Every structure is written in structure tokens, then in C-alpha cells.
Design a binder for this molecule. Structure first.
Ligand SMILES: [Zn+2]
Ligand SMILES: [Zn+2]
Lengths: 67, 115, 154, 45, 259
RNA sequence: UAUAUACAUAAAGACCAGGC
């Protein structure tokens, strides 16, 4: 749904790197250069940001129960 | 619904003794220690400190089952050296190692910062 | 408040010997069938334990001198049968002392205040004299805790 | 007595037992139960 | 028949990272050190969460999940706090726990991100780590949604639940160029060389050393941001020596009681 | 003071989907 805090394998924090990672893609970085600027060396962390699927933007289209 | 509590691994409830010492009838000077609520962190240190002691013929541990947390340590020493003495000297020798390592790691830090 | 034993069957009614020793007439539907306590125990006039099926002698009260089999027991009353008694199909009623042998916590929301579970909120499924069963709101499980540990919340 | 939330205009209305279900200011027939007052306490586990 | 005397050389020291090299030690002692870097280094992390009003698209215990995993600055007062189970007082006091508060409502039409910067602590010492670099994201809100909750953070360690691991991945390596033959390569020439390798590009492996035993245990210890990486290590040694000083005690009481 | 609140009800059948 929303990007995990704490990469599953190692336990580093990828929670805060998502909104910084979308910025780099719109600056015409390649996912290899984006993930290196964010400073994620191991491929356990590089698969959190790379394979992530953000549904919290879809789910915010529907209107809440309460106005 | 049957998942055991997370704390059940390192916490002792009422009546459980930490250590249980039972002599071993197969062998002279053989003793068998039973440590509740421990795992390979603690068991492996001691075994490997017992095998430095030249008066220790045998030392080894096992976790009987991984889902219940206890260690079982057999020790066999040479005559006129008690297997309870072997296991105490092991623990005091680690404490005298790890207290030397914590002091040598603090010196290398101060050296490392601005030096 | 009143129990009785059916002693005559009629087309629309029963004759019932009530616990006071009077026979009343009631419509079949005006009385409800009561669950008999075959394991009831009482004290006789000499403090013996008496039970259903026991043979007792009556030593005081209206039926003094009679002998009977205990058929039913309720509070201070015993319904007895003696086949020699033609009245009421053999049934009669005597005080047991005239004979001689011949929870609030459940539902509350409690907070575990001590021990390894300290802090968990739950609701009591079952209460005991000793260890209540708290239903944990945090996880899916039910645990037994000494009632000294629990603390009721609101 | 009982406060329900309209599924269309999202206006809490107070409607009670033995009443047809229609929210005022819409006419929409689907009501929701709001949320309980009592304490919920979770582990961060 | 006595303990060996090890030595330490700190190579890299930063705010995320420590590389040290421990020499003259057993394989079993050097391991049990890094095996304490995960479990038994205490840390502060949210445990008891109370959710007053949650209108977010994420259900209650899904947010109570993400809050736990948020690292909190444990730098000092972890020594001062007592485990909540050992603490005598009813419920939570200042001594066994820290209180956090999050009251967030989205008024604007724009989508609001609730960030760990919105956790507000009763004490200045422990805060979310990013507040000491973008902030951890707890949840997003559409206009009209409101999330307010109260959470008490406790002291614990990494055996209980993985949210108390003080560390990110803890590297461990010994004998980088393979003398001891603990691992046997079918073709030695296809394997890349360790950062720590002493070998020229020409030869694949060190030659077999019959007498040797593993020494020079290379670590890399990378913090999560709770504890500065220098004091993840000091707390592991001081925390292993306290478990071995709990044995010598309760063993001595048994040998004296049994005999 | 004594005594008491003791358990039963959710039918059955049909087709459909899946598991080993
Ligand atoms: Zn990772
Ligand atoms: Zn409406």
C-alpha cells in the first residue's frame, strides 16, 4: 500500500526515501543513479524502492466516510 | 492462536531455575549443565572457552529443540578437576576477556576522533 | 416461589402436592416442568447427609411415625413416597429436620498491571475465584492472569 | 439515540429503532455506524 | 588455560558506520559479539499505541505497525529507563516509558503527508530519529480525514520483536583470502576478491595453512540511527558481560546449595 | 441468614469452486 519503513532483510530505513526518490526520477536520473544518490548500497534495500507499488495514491481518490 | 509470546524466550517464570546441574553416570568426572532461557549466543562462547582448558577432555552444547529455549552442556574433565570448576573458570575468563575488549575499544575510539 | 409434585392426572388439569403439603388443582399449562436435582444433598434431624433414594423415618411434624423414600429435595423440603400411603398416590412432604435416615467481573475491560503482559488492555471472558481469563485486544489470544494483576479501566 | 453517517452526503443524522432509513438532505438509504467510543489499545508489534 | 587478549583497530568511523578489526580471538567469541549487536543492545521503540480517531485509509493496527518500526533516539536515557515488566509502578511512568502524541487533521484540499516529524514527545531527549534527510512517512490524508493517537515508547531489545534492533545489517567477515579452507571453491579463479584481500590479482587463493585458526575478524556495524554506531558496540560488550555475570552468580548459588 | 439464575440452538438438500 504505502512504502515500508524498515527494509525487510537488513532493517535499514527506506521509509523516508520514497518521496525523495520520486524527485530524482523527474530530474531524469536512471534508477541506478537515483538509488545511488539515496545511498542504498545493498541490493536488499535497492529492491524495496525499485519494486515498490504505491497504492496510497489510488486509495486517496475515493471520498472518506466523513466530510 | 497458539503462537507463543515473544518474551517467553528470555524471561523465566516462577519456579524455573536458571541452571540445573546433573551428574552423568556413563562417565567419571562428567557433568551435564542445563541452562534455561538461553541460546547459541551464550552456549557457544562457553564451549569454545572450555576447549582451551587443557584439563577439559570434552565439552559441547546442544539446543535440544529450537522451539523450546534451553541449552544442555556436557563437560568431562580429567580426574581431580571438578567439572563445576571447569565451567566457572570458563565464565570468569570470558568476563576477563570482554572487560579487556571494552576498554581497548574505548581507547581506539578516542584515538579515532581527532587523531 | 412454590414447587410441587404431580400426584393425579386429569384431562385438563393436574392435582399437585405443593411444598407446603396442600393439594392444588392446576391446568396442565399453568405449571412448568422443573429440572430435578438427583444429586441434591441435605441434612436430616441428626445432621446425617441424606440424598435422593434414601429411606428415612419421620420423627416430628404431621407425618411423624411414617417412613418413606426421598423422591425430590428443594430448599427445606423433601417429597417422599411410601407405597402404603394411598393418599396422593403415596406422595407426601416433610421438613428435612423432621427426618432421620433409617460473576461481577466478567464483561469489564481490565488492564494487566503486573507481570510479563503488563499494559495490555482486554475484556474478561470468564472470572474465577483466582485467575480470570482476559481477552487481549492487541493480539488474537486469550490468557489466564491472576486477579491481583488485573486493574479495571472505567 | 444512535448516530449514523450518510453514505452520500456524509452528514451524521440521529435516527432510532423502528424508523425507515433515509438521510435528511439527500434521500440516500445507506447509513454507516460511525465509530465506537471505548478504548482501543494496540501493540506496535 | 586462560582467556586470550584481543585488540581493536577502528578503520572507518562515521555517523552511520563503524568498521573495526578484532584480532587474537576465537571464532566463537567474535561471533557472539556481532550476534549481540542485533538482539541484546537495548533501544527505545513504540510499543503501546492508543488510537483515538482514525479516518485514514489505513486501518488501526496497520498504523500501529508502522509507528513501532520508527526508530527513536536512544543515545543516552536507555541506560536510565527500566524494563516495563521490572518497573514497579502501575501502568506507565516517566521512568519506564516515553509518551508520544500525534494529532493530525487535513483541512486543505492538498494531500497531507503525516510524517514522523509529527510525533510529539513529552521529553526532549527521545524524538524520532530523522528529527535529530526527509522524514519517515506514517500515512497520507485526503481532506476531511483525521488521525490522532497516543503512544508510549518502551525499552526492549531485538530478541522480542525486530523493531528493537539497534542496527541495520551487521557485516562479518574473517580470513578473506582463503587460507583455512573453511569454504572450498570448485574453481578458485571465478570468485571476486574481498575488500580485505591481501592478494595480488594474479593468484586466486592464499596457500593452505595447516596450523592456523581464524583471527582478524572484520566487522562493519551500521546503525539504524537510534544509537550512534560507536555506542552500539560498547553496549553489546557491556551487555554480554552482564549475561555472563548473571551466570557466575546463579551457578555459584547452585554449587553452594547443591553441596 | 438461607436459596436461586445449567446450557441449548443454529434444518436439510442441491449445485459450484478449491485443497491433498
Ligand atoms: Zn535492506
Ligand atoms: Zn444523507
Amino acid at each position: 500500500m504505502i512504502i515500508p519503513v524498515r527494509c525487510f532483510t537488513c532493517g535499514k530505513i527506506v521509509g523516508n526515501k520514497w518521496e525523495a526518490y520520486l524527485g530524482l526520477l523527474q530530474a531524469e536520473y536512471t534508477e541506478g543513479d537515483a538509488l545511488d544518490a539515496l545511498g542504498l548500497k545493498r541490493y536488499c534495500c535497492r529492491r524495496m524502492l525499485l519494486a515498490h507499488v504505491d497504492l496510497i495514491e489510488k486509495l486517496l481518490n475515493y471520498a472518506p466516510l466523513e466530510k | 492462536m497458539n503462537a507463543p509470546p515473544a518474551f517467553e524466550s528470555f524471561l523465566l517464570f516462577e519456579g524455573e531455575k536458571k541452571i540445573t546441574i546433573n551428574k552423568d553416570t556413563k562417565v567419571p568426572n562428567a557433568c551435564l549443565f542445563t541452562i534455561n532461557k538461553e541460546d547459541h549466543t551464550l552456549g557457544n562462547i562457553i564451549k569454545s572457552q572450555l576447549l582451551k582448558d587443557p584439563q577439559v577432555l570434552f565439552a559441547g552444547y546442544k539446543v535440544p529443540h529450537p522451539l523450546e529455549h534451553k541449552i544442555i552442556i556436557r563437560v568431562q574433565t580429567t580426574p581431580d578437576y571438578s567439572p563445576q570448576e571447569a565451567f566457572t573458570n570458563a565464565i570468569t575468563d570470558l568476563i576477563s576477556e570482554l572487560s579487556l575488549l571494552e576498554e581497548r575499544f574505548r581507547v581506539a575510539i578516542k584515538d579515532k576522533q581527532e587523531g | 416461589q412454590t414447587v410441587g409434585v404431580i400426584v393425579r392426572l386429569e384431562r385438563e388439569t393436574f392435582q399437585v402436592l405443593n411444598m407446603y403439603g396442600k393439594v392444588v388443582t392446576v391446568r396442565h399449562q399453568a405449571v412448568t416442568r422443573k429440572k430435578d436435582n438427583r444429586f441434591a444433598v441435605a441434612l436430616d434431624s441428626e445432621q446425617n447427609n441424606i440424598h435422593v433414594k434414601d429411606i428415612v423415618k419421620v420423627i416430628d411434624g404431621p407425618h411423624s411415625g411414617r417412613e418413606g423414600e426421598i423422591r425430590h429435595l428443594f430448599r427445606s423440603f423433601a417429597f417422599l413416597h411410601c407405597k402404603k400411603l394411598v393418599e396422593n398416590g403415596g406422595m407426601f412432604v416433610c421438613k428435612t429436620r423432621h427426618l432421620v435416615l433409617a460473576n461481577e467481573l466478567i464483561g469489564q475491560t481490565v488492564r494487566i498491571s503486573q507481570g510479563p503482559y503488563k499494559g495490555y488492555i482486554g475484556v474478561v471472558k470468564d472470572a474465577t475465584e483466582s485467575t480470570a481469563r482476559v481477552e487481549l485486544h492487541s493480539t488474537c489470544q486469550t490468557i489466564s492472569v491472576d486477579r491481583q494483576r488485573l486493574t479495571t479501566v472505567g | 439515540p444512535m448516530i449514523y453517517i450518510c453514505g452520500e452526503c456524509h452528514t451524521e443524522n440521529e435516527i432510532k429503532s423502528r424508523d425507515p432509513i433515509r438521510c435528511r438532505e439527500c434521500g440516500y438509504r445507506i447509513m454507516y455506524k460511525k465509530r465506537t467510543k471505548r478504548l482501543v489499545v494496540f501493540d506496535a508489534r | 588455560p586462560y582467556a586470550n587478549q584481543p585488540t581493536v583497530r577502528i578503520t572507518e568511523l562515521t555517523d552511520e558506520n563503524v568498521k573495526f578489526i578484532i584480532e587474537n580471538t576465537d571464532l566463537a567469541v567474535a561471533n557472539s559479539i556481532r550476534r549481540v549487536f542485533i538482539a541484546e543492545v537495548p533501544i527505545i521503540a513504540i510499543d503501546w499505541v492508543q488510537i483515538d480517531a482514525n479516518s485514514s485509509v489505513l486501518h488501526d493496527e496497520f498504523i500501529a505497525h508502522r509507528l513501532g518500526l520508527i526508530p527513536l533516539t536512544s543515545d543516552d536515557i536507555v541506560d536510565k529507563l527500566q524494563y516495563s515488566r521490572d518497573c514497579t509502578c502501575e501502568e506507565f511512568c516517566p521512568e519506564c516509558s516515553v509518551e508520544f502524541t500525534l494529532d493530525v487533521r487535513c483541512n486543505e484540499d492538498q494531500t497531507r503527508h503525516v510524517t514522523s516529524r509529527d510525533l510529539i514527545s513529552n521529553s526532549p531527549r527521545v524524538i524520532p530519529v530523522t528529527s535529530r534527510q526527509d522524514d519517515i512517512l506514517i500515512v497520507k490524508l485526503r481532506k476531511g480525514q483525521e488521525l490522532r493517537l497516543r503512544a508510549y515508547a518502551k525499552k526492549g531489545f531485538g530478541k522480542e520483536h525486530a523493531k528493537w534492533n539497534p542496527t541495520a545489517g551487521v557485516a562479518f567477515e574473517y580470513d578473506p583470502d582463503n587460507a583455512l579452507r573453511h569454504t572450498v571453491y570448485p574453481k578458485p579463479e571465478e570468485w571476486p576478491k574481498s575488500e580485505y584481500s591481501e592478494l595480488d590479482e594474479d593468484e586466486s587463493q592464499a596457500p593452505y595453512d595447516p596450523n592456523g585458526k581464524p583471527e582478524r575478524f572484520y566487522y562493519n556495524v551500521e546503525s539504524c540511527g537510534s544509537l550512534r554506531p560507536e555506542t552500539i558496540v560498547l553496549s553489546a560488550l557491556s551487555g554480554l558481560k552482564k549475561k555472563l555475570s548473571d551466570l557466575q552468580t546463579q551457578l555459584s548459588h547452585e554449587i553452594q546449595s547443591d553441596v
